[PDB]
Symmetry: C2
């Protein structure tokens, strides 16, 4: 089917951490790997993690070529937690965000997930410190077109 044929990939770079240790930093780059355009409004990305007691976990996008105001994020609890995830951050795009041509991509989209208390990122499904120096194929980040899985493997028991 036409929807079956749409394809995207995501690349990832692990950000920096300091001393307060209450900020998850990462950058993603979403590519249209198919032969027809994709609307950004149809794309969602999930970052799976353990919130380490933080009830409040706030998403911020710090840059996007098409404007930070096009990028949305919600952080939700997982009821039946799984290895590396009791929470996920779901990144999405506004209706007016634009579209990716075949072979096109967003380029860097850096974001933060902010908590009051410290995050230990080592016990997060989507965290991969091996991808700090260069963008890599972090298949523990998932992406969706019209709510159908197109990239990565979901955290799961």
């Amino acid at each position: 089917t036409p929807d079956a044929n749409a394809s995207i990939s995501v690349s990832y770079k692990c950000g920096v951490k300091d001393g307060t240790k209450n900020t998850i930093r990462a950058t993603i780059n979403i590519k249209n790997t198919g032969t027809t355009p994709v609307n950004l409004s149809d794309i969602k990305v999930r970052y799976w993690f353990t919130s380490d007691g933080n009830e409040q976990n706030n998403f911020v996008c710090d840059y996007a070529a098409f404007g930070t105001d096009k990028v949305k994020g919600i952080v939700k609890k997982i009821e039946n937690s799984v290895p590396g995830a009791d929470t996920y951050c779901e990144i999405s795009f506004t209706e007016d965000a634009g579209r990716l041509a075949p072979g096109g991509s967003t380029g860097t989209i850096p974001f933060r997930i902010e908590g009051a208390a410290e995050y230990d990122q080592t016990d997060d499904y989507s965290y991969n410190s091996e991808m700090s120096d260069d963008f890599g194929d972090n298949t523990k980040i998932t992406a969706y077109i019209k709510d159908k899985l197109k990239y990565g493997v979901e955290a799961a028991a």
Copy 2:
């Protein structure tokens, strides 16, 4: 310098030809390979060719994610022709075309160069029929940021 550090690459796919043989078809995909954004308005691309007697050679862009109305082309004669080129088509972008984030790209930008009489593309510097099945690194197409060469090798005696 900051300008020195900006970088782009271009990938290319050779289009189709038939029977009238008076249309050059190609697709390009421009990528920001640097670590700071690039404005599309600062980018130019040149396709170098022999016009085979055609005095009139018309550029058309058939698709772009950001709109065909953002893409401009002019075809100019080369006074002191060189191997594979007595003409070039210079593709550029409007002030409002948008920008490429680091790691971003345009995706497919198909275009045509239209002539009244037949083109023989085999004697064109920028033509590479080996890149018909997949996008490739056609370094006989040049690209520029603020009129400074950033990709490819210009046709030259």
